[PDB]
Each structure stands twice: as C-alpha cells, then as structure tokens.
Amino acid sequence: GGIFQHSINNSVDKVPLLGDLPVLGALFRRTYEQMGKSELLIFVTPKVVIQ
Amino acid sequence: GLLADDEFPVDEFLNVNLASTSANASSIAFQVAKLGSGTLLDLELSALQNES
Numbered sequence: 001g002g003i004f005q006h007s008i009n010n011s012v013d014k015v016p017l018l019g020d021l022p023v024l025g026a027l028f029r030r031t032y033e034q035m036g037k038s039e040l041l042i043f044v045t046p047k048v049v050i051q
Numbered sequence: 052g053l054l055a056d057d058e059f060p061v062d063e064f065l066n067v068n069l070a071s072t073s074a075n076a077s078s079i080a081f082q083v084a085k086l087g088s089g090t091l092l093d094l095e096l097s098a099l100q101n102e103s
Contacts, residue, residue: 013075013101030075 002041009034064093071097 014020014029021028070076080095 009103011101011103013099015077016098016100019100028077 002039004040005036005038007034007036070095071099073099075099075101 009032011032012019012029014025018027019025019029071078076097076099078095078097080093082091082093084091
C-alpha cells in the first residue's frame, strides 16, 4: 500500500483598485504562495531458505 | 476656555467615524487647518480587498 498527498495555497491582499494595475500594481499588494507534496510506499519480499 | 484638560479630544473631534476595521486596511487623509480663523477639517478614506 501507499499514501499520496498534494496541496496548494494562494493568497493576496491589496488596495481595492490600484493592486490590479499592470506593472505598478506590485506596489499595492501582498502575495503569498505555498505548495507541498508527500508520498509513502510499503514493499515486502519473502524467500525460502534452500540450505 | 471651559474644559480643563486640553491636549486634543481626538475622539470627541470626529463627526463621522466609520473606519474600515481590519489589520491590513490602507488609508489616506487630507486636512485643511487655519488656526487663525479657527477652522479645521479632516477627511480620511480606508479600504481593503483580499482573495484566497
């Protein structure tokens, strides 16, 4: 078996009209972004001892 | 001359007090102060808009 996980977060807080201007907008907003990924696996292997 | 304590009544001064109540709100404020004829007037705007 195994388990797989993934997650993504984005967020913005800005000034109602200025934080959207094409190049100047970056002066009127804070931007946050995060991404995570995880993976777990379990294996098994038997063998008969042939002396 | 009537009241005793006089530095400024910042809370008794304001007529309309409806400020945007948040921690990330942005504002801007304009003033006209004479102090010769006495007149004073203040005006501040504040806003916020976020998304997630």
